[PDB]
Amino acid sequence: SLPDLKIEKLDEGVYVHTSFEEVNGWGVVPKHGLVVLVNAEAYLIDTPFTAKDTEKLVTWFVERGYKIKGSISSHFHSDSTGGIEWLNSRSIPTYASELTNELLKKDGKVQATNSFSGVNYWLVKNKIEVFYPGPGHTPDNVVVWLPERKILFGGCFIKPYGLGNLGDANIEAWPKSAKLLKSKYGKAKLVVPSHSEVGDASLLKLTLEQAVKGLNESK
Ligand SMILES: O=C(O)[C@H]1CS[C@@H]2CS[C@@H](CS)N12
Ligand SMILES: O=C(O)[C@H]1CS[C@@H]2CS[C@@H](CS)N12
Numbered sequence: 001s002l003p004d005l006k007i008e009k010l011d012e013g014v015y016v017h018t019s020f021e022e023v024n025g026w027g028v029v030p031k032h033g034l035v036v037l038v039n040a041e042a043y044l045i046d047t048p049f050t051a052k053d054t055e056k057l058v059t060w061f062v063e064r065g066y067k068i069k070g071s072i073s074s075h076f077h078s079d080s081t082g083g084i085e086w087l088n089s090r091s092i093p094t095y096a097s098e099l100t101n102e103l104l105k106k107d108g109k110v111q112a113t114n115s116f117s118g119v120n121y122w123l124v125k126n127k128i129e130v131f132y133p134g135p136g137h138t139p140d141n142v143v144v145w146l147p148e149r150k151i152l153f154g155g156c157f158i159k160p161y162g163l164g165n166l167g168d169a170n171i172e173a174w175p176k177s178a179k180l181l182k183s184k185y186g187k188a189k190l191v192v193p194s195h196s197e198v199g200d201a202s203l204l205k206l207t208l209e210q211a212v213k214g215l216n217e218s219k
């Protein structure tokens with residue numbers, strides 16, 4: 001059977017949640033997201049694959065005295081949005097970019113209740129920032145920046161050992177978007193990818209290199 005949901009401290013007021021799903025043609029896929037604590041309030045950065053793991057994640061932090069103020073999804077794939085329907089049914093505010101919500105809608109999936117558009121957005125002013133580097137892994141991928149800890153959640157945009165599933169990717173744009181990502185957050189202390197281990201700012205370098213190499217290889 002599949003591994004249980006994992007919750008691990010990464011830094012002060014910052015936890016990594018890891019959930020697991022069997023995906024056809026991929027085998028068992030790990031997915032990392034974060035839980036960010038601001039005072040006594042918690043923010044989900046990406047939901048687990050399932051409502052079950054989302055519920056478990058929420059209860060773990062609620063049982064420890066944290067109010068769940070919201071979740072934000074970094075792109076539309078279920079690995080980031082799987083728990084939105086369950087969160088909505090609990091009246092926990094869900095966030096996604098306008099484009100992410102359009103893509104959820106187009107696929108007949110439940111949308112987040114709050115949307116944002118533009119290159120930058122503060123989910124929490126001075127604490128949790130959202131940034132759109134451009135198309136890459138998907139047209140809508142965004143990253144999440146924690147300035148106080150210098151932690152960058154790169155999600156499925158960060159792909160140091162190969163680009164992974166290209167079904168919705170924009171291979172033409174990814175090098176440019178990754179370049180933009182590298183400049184803005186080159187000083188990242190920690191970078192958290194969706195499907196591999198936490199690294200440092202070099203993960204931005206490797207992603208850029210992998211993207212460049214993928215576009216060339218496609219020609
Ligand atoms: O709101 C929507 O876009 C569609 C897709 S998923 C969401 C909940 S059930 C369905 C209307 S019956 N509905
Ligand atoms: O993120 C990706 O590129 C691939 C690698 S593991 C998982 C299988 S399909 C896609 C959903 S985010 N994803």
Ligand SMILES: [Zn+2]
Nearest residue numbers: 075077079156
């Ligand atoms: Zn994805």
Ligand SMILES: [Zn+2]
Nearest residue numbers: 079156194195
């Ligand atoms: Zn992914």
